[PDB]
Amino acid sequence: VIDIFPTGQTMSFLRLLHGFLGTCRGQSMHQVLRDPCVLRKQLLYGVCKTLFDTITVRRVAEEWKLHAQYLLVWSASLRQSVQTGVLGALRDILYQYADNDDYGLYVDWCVTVGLVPLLDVKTKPSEAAERAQFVRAAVQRATETHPLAQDLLQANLALLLQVAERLGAVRVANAPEVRVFKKVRSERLEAQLRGKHIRLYVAAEPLAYERDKLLFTTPVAHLHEEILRYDGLCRHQKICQLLNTFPVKVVTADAELYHLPVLEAVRKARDAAPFRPLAVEDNRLVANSFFSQFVPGTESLERFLTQLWENEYFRTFRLRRLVTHQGAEEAIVYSNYTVERVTLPYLCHILALGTLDPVPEAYLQLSFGEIVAAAYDDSKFCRYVELICSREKARRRQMSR
Amino acid sequence: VIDIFPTGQTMSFLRLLHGFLGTCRGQSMHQVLRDPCVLRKQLLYGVCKTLFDTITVRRVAEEWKLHAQYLLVWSASLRQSVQTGVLGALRDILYQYADNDDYGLYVDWCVTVGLVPLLDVKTKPSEAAERAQFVRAAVQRATETHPLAQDLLQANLALLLQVAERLGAVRVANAPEVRVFKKVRSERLEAQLRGKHIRLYVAAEPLAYERDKLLFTTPVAHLHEEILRYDGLCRHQKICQLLNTFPVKVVTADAELYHLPVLEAVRKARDAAPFRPLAVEDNRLVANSFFSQFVPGTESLERFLTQLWENEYFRTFRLRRLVTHQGAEEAIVYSNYTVERVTLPYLCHILALGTLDPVPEAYLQLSFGEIVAAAYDDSKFCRYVELICSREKARRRQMSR
Amino acid sequence: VIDIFPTGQTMSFLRLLHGFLGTCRGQSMHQVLRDPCVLRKQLLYGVCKTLFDTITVRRVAEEWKLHAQYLLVWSASLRQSVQTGVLGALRDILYQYADNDDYGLYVDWCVTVGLVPLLDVKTKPSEAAERAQFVRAAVQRATETHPLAQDLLQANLALLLQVAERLGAVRVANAPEVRVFKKVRSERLEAQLRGKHIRLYVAAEPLAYERDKLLFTTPVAHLHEEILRYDGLCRHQKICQLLNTFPVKVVTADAELYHLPVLEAVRKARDAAPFRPLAVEDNRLVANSFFSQFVPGTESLERFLTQLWENEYFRTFRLRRLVTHQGAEEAIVYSNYTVERVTLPYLCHILALGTLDPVPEAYLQLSFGEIVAAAYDDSKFCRYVELICSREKARRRQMSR
Secondary structure (H helix, E strand, O other), X not given: OEEOOOOOXXXXXXXXXXXXXXXXXXXXXXXXXXXXXOHHHHHHHHHHHHHOOOOOHHHHHHHHHOOOOOOOHHHHHHHHHHHHHHHHHHHHHXXXXXXXXXXXXXXXXXXXXXXXXXXXXXXXXXXXXHHHHHHHHXXXXXXXXXXXXXXXXXXXXXXXXXXXXXXXXXXXXXXXXXXXXXXXXXXXXXXXXXXXXXXXXXXXXXXXXXXXXXXXXXXXXXXXXXXXXXXXXXXXXXHHHHOOOOOOOEEEXXXXXXXXXXXXXXXXXXXXOOOOOEEOOOXXXXXXXXXXXOOOOOHHHHHHHHHHHHHHHHHXXXXXXXXXXXXOEEEEEOOOOHHHHHHHHHHXXXXXXXXXXXXXXXXXXXOOOOXXXXXXXXXXXXXXXXXXXXXXXXXXXXXXX | OEEOOOOOOHHHHHHXXXXXXXXXXXXXXXXXXXXXXXXXXXXXXXXXXXXXXXXXXXXXXXXXXXXXXXXXXXXXHHHHXXXXXXXXXXXXXXXXOOOOHHHHHHHHHHOOOOEEEOEOOXXXXXXXXXXXXXXXXXXXXXXXXXXXXXXXXXXXXXXXXXXXXXXXXXXXXXXXXXXEEEOOOOOOOOEEEOOEEEOEXXXXXXXXXXXXXXXXXXXXXXXXXXXXHHHHHHHHHHHHHHOOOOOOOEXXXXXXXXXXOHHHHHHHHHHHXXXXXXXOOOOOOOOEEOOOOOOOOOOOOHHHHHXXXXXXXXXXXXXXXXXXXXXXXXXXXXXXXXXXXXXXXXXXXXXXXXXXXOOOOHHHHOOOOOHHHHHHHOOOHHHHHHHHHHHHHHHOOHXXX | OEEOOOOOOOOHHHHOOOOOOOOOOOHHHOHHHHOOOOHHHHHHHHHHHHHOOOOOHHHXXXXXXXXXXXXXXXXXXXXXXXXXXXXXXXXXXXXXOOOOHHHHHHHHHHOXXXXXXXXXXXXXXXXXXXXXXXXXXHHHHHOOOOOOHHHHHHHOHHHHHHOOOOOOOOEOOOOOOEEEEEOOOOOOEEEEEOOEEOOEEXXXXXXXXXXXXXXXXXXXOOOHHHHHHXXXXXXXXXXXXXXXXXXXXXXXXXXXXXXXXXXXXXXXXXXXXXXXXXXXXXXXXXXXXXXXXXXXXXXXXXXXXXXXXXXXXXXXXXXXXXXXXXXXXXXXXXXXXXXXXXXXXXXXXXXXXXXXXXXXXXXXXXXXXXXXXXXXXXXXXXXXXXXXXXXXXXXXXXXXX
C-alpha cells in the first residue's frame, strides 16, 4: 500500500536527473550511457552473428563453381558484396521499426529509481501485415549488389520475422498517471497504469527495512542530497550577492545599458536601485554597528560535485575512457562490463530474449558499416572461404603432379 | 491540448542557442555539429557507393579490349577519369538542387527540443520536368573526360531520378505561426501549421509525468538554467560596476574622448556624471555609515559554462577531437557515432530512405574530391581492375609456355 | 514587408565586423577567410584540371616523333614548358579580368547576415568583343615557350570563353541604397535595389518564428552582444579612469610635455586640470563620507572575447592551424572543408557553374606557380608520358631480340 513513485521524494528524484535545480560538469556523465543507438549496434551485432551462422559449404561453393592470387581476391569481392549487401537490408528494417526513445526511458529510470515499467499491445493483423510486407520487400537492396544475400535472408527469415514482433510491441511508458506499488501484505512489486495492472521488473530493488520507509540502491540516491545541497547554496549565493550592491549603506534612528552611452547609464543606475536606508525606533537609542561583506564560495564544491558524478558513474558502471597525450579526455565509450550490465538486461526482459550476444568493447566503437565486417571475421565465412580457397588450390595444384 | 512550443519556456529555450542573453566559449560547440555540408558528403558517399556496385565485368573489359607495368598504370588512368568523371556530374546535381538550410534547422531543433516539424509539396509536372531535363543534361561533364561515365549514369539513372524527388520536396519549417501539439485524451504527438495538420516525428520525445507539465530529454534543458544564470549575473555585473563610478560618495541629513586631448576630457568627465548626493530626512538624526566597493565574480563561472557546453556535447554526441603536441586543440570532426545518431535519423525519415550508408569517420574529414576515390577503394572496381589486370597478364604470360 | 537590412540592429551588426566600437585579437580571425586570392587559386585549379583532360595520345605522341635516361628527362622538359607555358596564358587572363573585391563582399556578407545580394549586366558587343580579342591575343605567352600550348588552348578555348561571360558580369553591390526584403504575405525572400527587384540567395536563412521579429543563424549574432558589451565596458573604463585624476578631492558645504623640460611640465599640469571642489548646500549640515578608488577590469574579459572569436571561427568553418615546436602559431590556411563550405557555394551560384572542382587542402597553401604542376600530377599527362616512355622504350628495347 506504500507508494513509491508519486511521493515527495521520488518526483524530485527524477527531476534532479535533468536541469531543474542543480547542474555541474558531471550531469552530462549520465548522458553518455543514456544515449540510444548503442542498442542499435548491439542488436545489429546480435542479429548478424546469427545471420552468418546457418550456412553450409554446398550453397556457397556452387557460387565459386559459377565464378569461372586469383583465389584470395575472391574473398573480399564476396565479403564486400555481403558487407553492404546484408547491411542495406539490415539498416532499413531497423530505422523504420526501432523507436529511438524506448531505450532512453529505461536507462532514465533504472539508474534513477530501479523500478522501470513497460507496456504491451494486442497485435491485430493490420499491425503485423505491414511488417510482413516490409520484411518481404526488404529483398530489394539484396538484389543488385549480391545474388547470395536473398538466399541468405530466405534461410534466416525466421529471426528477421521474430525480431519484428517484440521490438515494436513493448514501450516504457511516459504516461502522466503511472506509479509502482509496494505491497505490504504478502509483499510484492506490482505496477499499475490507468487503474489496471501492468508488467514491471526489478533490477535495482529497494532495501525495505523500516516500516513505511524505503532505501534505494540506485546510483542517484548516493548523490541526491548533495545535488540538492548545491542548489541550496546556489540560490543562497545569488541572494547573498544581491542585497549588497548599493555601495554605501547607513543605519539611522532591461538590458539596454549595452546599447546606450555611459552618461545615460550612470544616470539610470542610481534610480534603478534607489537609496533606501534601514532603521528601527528605540527608547534608549544607542547603537553599535558592524559590517559583513560576504559571499559563499560556489567554486569550491562544484569541483566536488563534478568529481562526485564522474567518480560515481565510473564506479557503478565502469565506463572506458580514451585518453591521449597531455591527459586530454576524449569521447567515452562503453566497456565490456556495462554493455552486459545495462543493455543486456534491457535485452533479456524487454526485447527478444535468448538468441543475441553482447558486443565486445572495441566493436562498439567501430563504424556502423564496419561492424558487419568485424562480425564477419568472427563468423564462419572467413573459415569457409579459406577452406574453399585451400581445397580448390590443392585440386588445381596437384594437376602438375 | 497542452501547448509545447509557443510557451513561456520553450521560446527562450530556443532563443538561448543564439546570442540573445548568454554567450560563453561553448556556444560555438553546438555549431560544429550544426554545420551543413556534412550531409552533402554523406549523401555523396551514399549515392556513389551504390553508383559503383551495379556493373559486371563484361562492360568494362571491352574497354580494355579497345585500349589496344602496362597493366598497372591502366588502373589509375581509369580511376582518375572516373574520379572526376562521375564527380562533375555528381557535384552540379547537388548544388542546383540541395538546399543548404534544410539540415541546419533540423539540428537547430533536435538538440534543442526534439520535436522537429517538416513540410511537403504537391508535385506538378512543371516542378519535376525541369529536374528530369537536368538529370539528362547532367551527362555533359560525363562526355569528354570519360566514355564509361555516360554508360554508368545510364545504368544507375534510377537512383539519380529517385534522389531528385524527395530531397527538394521536404522542408523543415521556419514558419512564424507553427507549433507542436500535445494531446491529453488518447495521447499522441501531432503537429499543427496554418490551422492544418502536418507531419512531425520524435527523436527526443519528452518524458511526461506530471500533469500539465513537461520534461525535455534534450541536451539544452540540462544547461538551460545555468545559461540563464550567466545572464542573471552578467547584468548584475554591469549594474554593479556602474553605480559606484563616482569616487567620493557622501551622505547627509559619446565616445569622442579618444580623439580630443585630456584638457577637454577631464573637463567633460566631471559634468558627464555630476555630483549627486544621497540623503533621507530624520527626526533623531544619528547615523552610522559603512561602505563596500563590490563586484560579482563574472570570471569564475564563465570557465564553468564553457566546460559545461564542451563537456556536455562531448557526452551527448561524442565528438572526435584532433589534438596535436602541447595539447593544442584543432578543428573538430564528426565521429562514427554522431553521424549515425544525427544524420541517419535525418536521412531515414526526411530524405530518401533505405539505400544509402553512413560514411566512416576518417572519410568525413577527407577532401570533397578524393572521397569518390575513397569509396572507389571500397567498391568493386578495384577488385575488377585487379582481376582483369591479372587474368589478361596470365593470358599474355602463358604464351611463352 | 518586414525590413531586415536597414534597421536598428543590422546596420551596427555589420559595423561590428570592422573596427567601429569593439576590437580584440580575434577580429582579425574573420580576415583569414575574408581574404581574396583563394578564389583565384581555386578557379585556377578548377580550370587547369579541365584544361589537361581533353587530350588523347595521338596529338602528343607526334611531338615525340618530332623530338628525334633519354626517355625520363623528356617528361620534365615537357612538364616545365607546359608549367610556365599555360600559366603565362593563365596569369594574364585572370588579373585583367578577375575583380579582387567581388569575393570579399560576399564573405563579408555571408558570415554576417546570410542574405548576400548580387547584380547583373546586359552584355553589349563592345563589352564582349574586347574580351574575345584578349583571349585570342593571350596566345603570345603560349608561342615561344611551348609549341603544344597553342594547340591546347585552341582545343579548350570553349571553357576559356565560358569563364569570361559570367565572372566579370556579376557584382555584389556595395551600393548605398540597398536592402534585402522579407515578405509576410505568401512569404518569400526577395531583394530590392534602386526601386527594382534583384537576385539574391539564402545560405544562412533566418529563423522566422516570432511575428515582426527575426533570428539569425549567422556566426556573428552569436557574439554580437558580447562585442557590444566589450565596448560598453571599455568606454566605461575610460570614463572611470579619467574622472579621478586629481589626487586630492575634498567636499565642503596638447602633447608638448614630451618636448619641454619638467619645470614647465609640472607648472602646466596644475592649470590643465584646476582644483574644482564638490559641494551641496544643506540645512542640517552633518556629512559622513567615503572614497572609491576604482577601475573596471577590462583586461580579464578581452582574453575571453578573443577566445570567443577564435573558438567560434574554428567551429563554424573548422580552419586548420599550422603549429610548430613550443606551440607557436603560424599562418592559418583554409581547411579541406571550408573551401567547400564558403568558396564553392560562391562558385555554384555567383560564378560559372558545374565544371570546376574544389581544390584540396595542401594544394591551397602551395605556390601559385607549382599548382599547375600539382594538378599536372593529378591529370592524365603524367600517365601519358609514362605510357609513351614505356611503349617506345619497349619498341626500341626488343630490337636486340
